[PDB]
Design a protein around this ligand. Sequence first.
Ligand SMILES: N[C@@H](Cc1c[nH]c2ccccc12)C(=O)O
Ligand SMILES: [Mg+2]
Ligand SMILES: [Mg+2]
Ligand SMILES: [Mg+2]
Ligand SMILES: [Mg+2]
Ligand SMILES: [Mg+2]
Ligand SMILES: [Mg+2]
Ligand SMILES: [Mg+2]
Ligand SMILES: [Mg+2]
Ligand SMILES: [Mg+2]
Ligand SMILES: [Mg+2]
Ligand SMILES: [Mg+2]
Ligand SMILES: [Mg+2]
Ligand SMILES: [Mg+2]
Ligand SMILES: [Mg+2]
Ligand SMILES: [Mg+2]
Ligand SMILES: [Mg+2]
Ligand SMILES: [Mg+2]
Ligand SMILES: [Mg+2]
Ligand SMILES: [Mg+2]
Ligand SMILES: [Mg+2]
Ligand SMILES: [Mg+2]
Ligand SMILES: [Mg+2]
Ligand SMILES: [Mg+2]
Ligand SMILES: [Mg+2]
Ligand SMILES: [Mg+2]
Ligand SMILES: [Mg+2]
Ligand SMILES: [Mg+2]
Ligand SMILES: [Mg+2]
Ligand SMILES: [Mg+2]
Ligand SMILES: [Mg+2]
Ligand SMILES: [Mg+2]
Ligand SMILES: [Mg+2]
Ligand SMILES: [Mg+2]
Ligand SMILES: [Mg+2]
Ligand SMILES: [Mg+2]
Ligand SMILES: [Mg+2]
Ligand SMILES: [Mg+2]
Ligand SMILES: [Mg+2]
Ligand SMILES: [Mg+2]
Ligand SMILES: [Mg+2]
Ligand SMILES: [Mg+2]
Ligand SMILES: [Mg+2]
Ligand SMILES: [Mg+2]
Ligand SMILES: [Mg+2]
Ligand SMILES: [Mg+2]
Ligand SMILES: [Mg+2]
Ligand SMILES: [Mg+2]
Ligand SMILES: [Mg+2]
Ligand SMILES: [Mg+2]
Ligand SMILES: [Mg+2]
Ligand SMILES: [Mg+2]
Ligand SMILES: [Mg+2]
Ligand SMILES: [Mg+2]
Ligand SMILES: [Mg+2]
Ligand SMILES: [Mg+2]
Ligand SMILES: [Mg+2]
Ligand SMILES: [Mg+2]
Lengths: 16, 93, 46, 271
Amino acid sequence: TSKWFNIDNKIVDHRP
Amino acid sequence: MIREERLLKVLRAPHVSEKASTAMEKSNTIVLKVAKDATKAEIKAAVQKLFEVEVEVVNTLVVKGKVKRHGQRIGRRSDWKKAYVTLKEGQNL
Amino acid sequence: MKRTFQPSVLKRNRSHGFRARMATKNGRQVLARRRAKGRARLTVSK
Amino acid sequence: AVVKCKPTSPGRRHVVKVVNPELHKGKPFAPLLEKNSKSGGRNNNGRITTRHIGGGHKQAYRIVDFKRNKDGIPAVVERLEYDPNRSANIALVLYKDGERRYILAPKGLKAGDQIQSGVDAAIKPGNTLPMRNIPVGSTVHNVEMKPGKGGQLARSAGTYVQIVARDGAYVTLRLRSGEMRKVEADCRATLGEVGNAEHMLRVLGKAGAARWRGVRPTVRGTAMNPVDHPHGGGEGRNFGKHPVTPWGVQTKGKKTRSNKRTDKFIVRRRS
RNA sequence: ACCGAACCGACUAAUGUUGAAAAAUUAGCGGAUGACUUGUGGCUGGGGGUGAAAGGCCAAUCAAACCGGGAGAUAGCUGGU
RNA sequence: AAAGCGGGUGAAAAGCCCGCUCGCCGGAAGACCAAGGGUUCCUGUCCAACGUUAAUCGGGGCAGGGUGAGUCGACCCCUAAGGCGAGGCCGAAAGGCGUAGUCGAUGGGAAACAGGUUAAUAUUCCUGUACUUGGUGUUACUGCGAAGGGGGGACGGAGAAGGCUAUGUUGGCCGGGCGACGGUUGUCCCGGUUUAAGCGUGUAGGCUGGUUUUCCAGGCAAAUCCGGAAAAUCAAGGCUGAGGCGUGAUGACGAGGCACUACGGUGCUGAAGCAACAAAUGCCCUGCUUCCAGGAAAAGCCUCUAAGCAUCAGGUAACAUCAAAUCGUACCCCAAACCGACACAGGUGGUCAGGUAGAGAAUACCAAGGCGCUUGAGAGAACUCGGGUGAAGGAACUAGGCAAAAUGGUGCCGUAACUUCGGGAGAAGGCACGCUGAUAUGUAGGUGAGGUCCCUCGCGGAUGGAGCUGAAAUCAGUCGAAGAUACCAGCUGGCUGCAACUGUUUAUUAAAAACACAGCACUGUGCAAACACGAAAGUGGACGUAUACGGUGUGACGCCUGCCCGG
Ligand SMILES: N[C@@H](Cc1c[nH]c2ccccc12)C(=O)O
Ligand SMILES: [Mg+2]
Ligand SMILES: [Mg+2]
Ligand SMILES: [Mg+2]
Ligand SMILES: [Mg+2]
Ligand SMILES: [Mg+2]
Ligand SMILES: [Mg+2]
Ligand SMILES: [Mg+2]
Ligand SMILES: [Mg+2]
Ligand SMILES: [Mg+2]
Ligand SMILES: [Mg+2]
Ligand SMILES: [Mg+2]
Ligand SMILES: [Mg+2]
Ligand SMILES: [Mg+2]
Ligand SMILES: [Mg+2]
Ligand SMILES: [Mg+2]
Ligand SMILES: [Mg+2]
Ligand SMILES: [Mg+2]
Ligand SMILES: [Mg+2]
Ligand SMILES: [Mg+2]
Ligand SMILES: [Mg+2]
Ligand SMILES: [Mg+2]
Ligand SMILES: [Mg+2]
Ligand SMILES: [Mg+2]
Ligand SMILES: [Mg+2]
Ligand SMILES: [Mg+2]
Ligand SMILES: [Mg+2]
Ligand SMILES: [Mg+2]
Ligand SMILES: [Mg+2]
Ligand SMILES: [Mg+2]
Ligand SMILES: [Mg+2]
Ligand SMILES: [Mg+2]
Ligand SMILES: [Mg+2]
Ligand SMILES: [Mg+2]
Ligand SMILES: [Mg+2]
Ligand SMILES: [Mg+2]
Ligand SMILES: [Mg+2]
Ligand SMILES: [Mg+2]
Ligand SMILES: [Mg+2]
Ligand SMILES: [Mg+2]
Ligand SMILES: [Mg+2]
Ligand SMILES: [Mg+2]
Ligand SMILES: [Mg+2]
Ligand SMILES: [Mg+2]
Ligand SMILES: [Mg+2]
Ligand SMILES: [Mg+2]
Ligand SMILES: [Mg+2]
Ligand SMILES: [Mg+2]
Ligand SMILES: [Mg+2]
Ligand SMILES: [Mg+2]
Ligand SMILES: [Mg+2]
Ligand SMILES: [Mg+2]
Ligand SMILES: [Mg+2]
Ligand SMILES: [Mg+2]
Ligand SMILES: [Mg+2]
Ligand SMILES: [Mg+2]
Ligand SMILES: [Mg+2]
Ligand SMILES: [Mg+2]
């Protein structure tokens, strides 16, 4: 499936 | 009354094993492989009238099939019934 | 963790068994579809 | 009696309970009990049709004689009993011929009393007469709507129906809603207010007491989401809507009675 | 009601994060006769259910499940030719 | 949770087998099941593949064996929730509901225990001793009969105590020992001291007044049954019931001793086999007391009659005989066999419940019993993880005392503001605590033999204290740095926001001030109720009736809730 650090929100939305 | 057709069909085979031999030499019991749709009364009548002996009681159990492998092709050895027939101390087949 | 399959033969047979398939009208359609495909096993009974 | 509990715990601080020493303490009458299963507010389709019903204590139904049809035979009121299916107390009453029945207990009736039904019965509480025989101005309860149907009006605890007029074949009853209704003069009615008036003075004291009576919690539409209730939504606490039921009909003032079949019988609304 | 095991839960910290585990371990933590918890069985079905209400849950999937079908939807867009 | 060594087998041994140690669990990591799985069970043989290494081993391959029932469970009779549903009501069709019925356990219904045996089954086989239901046939008496009436089955939460038992400890008795190193013929050490269902008696306890007449608008008709009414008469009659005792049992079992062994285990014999005390969460007890939230149904069972049969059938009691079929029974079951893709630190319902200390099912160490977690051997860098201790200082760290450290038990003294008079409160704070002797060769208390007396006469009562068990306290002495010595086991106080409180919530980053709440107000609703599900029939609301039900908002309690109808 998918990696947890890609599902996470604090590190994915790192540069809004 | 149970017909001779039915009796001659229900008795299938004797059974040979260490436990069957011990039962014969200890409790005057014979072990018979029996067709599956035979009841205790049918086995008792068949033994009593075909082996010319006399039966105290009969005990039945169904032996389950075995899952086997023949060249990576799965198969299933079939069921049969086993009968422990007890005789009245003076028959000695 | 408790997973989604907690098996029970009675509930299995009342839900997906052959007599429930024949009881509902669309279950008979399910059996028709599986027979037309040619399944070895139609329902969960065998 | 109305007895306040001492505040030895936060749940028991506000509790007011009604204790009645005259009630029977043993088991009720096995010939007259029945089972009823709880529904949870679910109909034969299985859907919740009435919200906030479910759980509570298990109960047994008591067959209560609302018809009061055994006329001409005097009856001895034996004992008062707790019925869990209604607010009022029931009374196990022994007729003179050996058959026992459950009736509603009117106010003032006690153990070992005399009651009697029929057209020739005396005018005293507990006695059942047709309202053509019942004098005007007198308070009755357990009032019928159709002759022989059974009692349907003034059946909860402490309620009564006042006969104000008799015009030909119909009598006018003032009902506890304040409502004037014409009913047939042949309909039966039992004299006297229903007992257990102190039932209205109870305080449950806790959510546990409500759940014992069998009512699930009520969620406000203003706390729901917009997809759930017409009131739901808002950042913070926002309402901005006219108050409606969850299916969209206005719920503060909008009248919902529409029965042109019984508009002929209704004389005055409850105002 | 109170303290505290079973049992139910999940407040804090560290570890783990291609893990022993697609949500746990360790040390502490809350309830623990009640609006409690649990076994077997039944019922409610997708614009529907159920919801002490978080758009939560409905088989590791939910601002509308899964499966097959209209279906080779459409794509003024990207890639390839 | 942890291994070491000796021997055996083998081509080869850290892992397999045997032995001696060492360690871990022991309300489980032990034993038995239900659910689920399906041969994983036992024996012989093999090491390609599977096993996170090797392999002689295995839950792997191959072959053979193994599951024995009138009494256990299913099947079967009976119903719950609910399902299906002849006719029927309804709906474009399909189909929706539903009466009579008929299914549906998670519940109600008859009966077996102890010992022994197999490599693998046993409440199933064998030995011993029992019990249940039904059919047939003799004997004796006789009003039998339901799809109907009645009783019963038949029922909640909490609490308290009495009587007991399982069970344990000690004593007695029986068998054995006189100790690798000071002492050990003694108040010394080790072990054993088990016995069931059934049958007989009916005790502690619990419930209820019996017995005989006459009458009756009730129990869909009848009733000798149930209910009701009026008399007479008697006072102990009935029902239920743990345990104990006798029998079952001159039997079985029994530490050990004796002899073979294919050293794995077999064959023979066998003493004592009692008492006191402590004691359950188990039994009497589906009891008793109390509370409000007022606590399944039907059949089996007992009983009464209708139609009918009427010296027949049928019923009751004894005896004899026959029958009780069919299916499951191996093995795992807190797990390497079930659900998690794995021989996966997860999950999974019930039953049993030993010793010491302890309030205890916590916890520490142990017993029965089971394991050492399928890679090891070295070395003793940085660094990471889990811990231990630390001079002086003591929050100076940091967003923040996060984390860690500390407090921690029983008895007594004592304890503030505030308060809804309950609380706050274990407020805060302090003192004692080990061991030996004496009071007292072991006390107060508990249990209670022998003996004696009495009797409506035995499982009886009064006296009486043998014996057993046994706190707590005071005084004196003594040891240590320290006596709740380990494990286990509150940090406390002050000001304040919010929500009254217990609870519920985003399974899987949010447990909150959100949701709920008891209480309050408005409003709808007269019953064929409003309202909801449904093209409809129906159903919930409710077998409820305005002191009730639905909707909406606020949220205990105290003081309050002011003006505006223009939109
Ligand atoms: N990383 C954590 C938490 C986690 C699981 N799934 C996630 C998905 C998204 C973010 C975090 C997670 C874990 O592996 O258990
Ligand atoms: Mg036999
Ligand atoms: Mg069998
Ligand atoms: Mg409501
Ligand atoms: Mg409310
Ligand atoms: Mg919201
Ligand atoms: Mg809307
Ligand atoms: Mg705002
Ligand atoms: Mg505004
Ligand atoms: Mg509590
Ligand atoms: Mg939760
Ligand atoms: Mg959290
Ligand atoms: Mg934890
Ligand atoms: Mg608490
Ligand atoms: Mg607690
Ligand atoms: Mg939102
Ligand atoms: Mg999911
Ligand atoms: Mg959509
Ligand atoms: Mg198209
Ligand atoms: Mg496409
Ligand atoms: Mg070796
Ligand atoms: Mg090893
Ligand atoms: Mg070994
Ligand atoms: Mg240990
Ligand atoms: Mg196999
Ligand atoms: Mg094996
Ligand atoms: Mg090799
Ligand atoms: Mg290998
Ligand atoms: Mg094998
Ligand atoms: Mg039914
Ligand atoms: Mg039909
Ligand atoms: Mg139907
Ligand atoms: Mg049936
Ligand atoms: Mg059952
Ligand atoms: Mg075995
Ligand atoms: Mg004893
Ligand atoms: Mg208990
Ligand atoms: Mg077994
Ligand atoms: Mg392993
Ligand atoms: Mg595991
Ligand atoms: Mg558990
Ligand atoms: Mg423990
Ligand atoms: Mg190191
Ligand atoms: Mg460190
Ligand atoms: Mg430290
Ligand atoms: Mg320091
Ligand atoms: Mg220091
Ligand atoms: Mg300091
Ligand atoms: Mg700084
Ligand atoms: Mg600072
Ligand atoms: Mg901390
Ligand atoms: Mg610590
Ligand atoms: Mg002392
Ligand atoms: Mg502030
Ligand atoms: Mg709160
Ligand atoms: Mg969460
Ligand atoms: Mg609010
Ligand atoms: Mg105002």
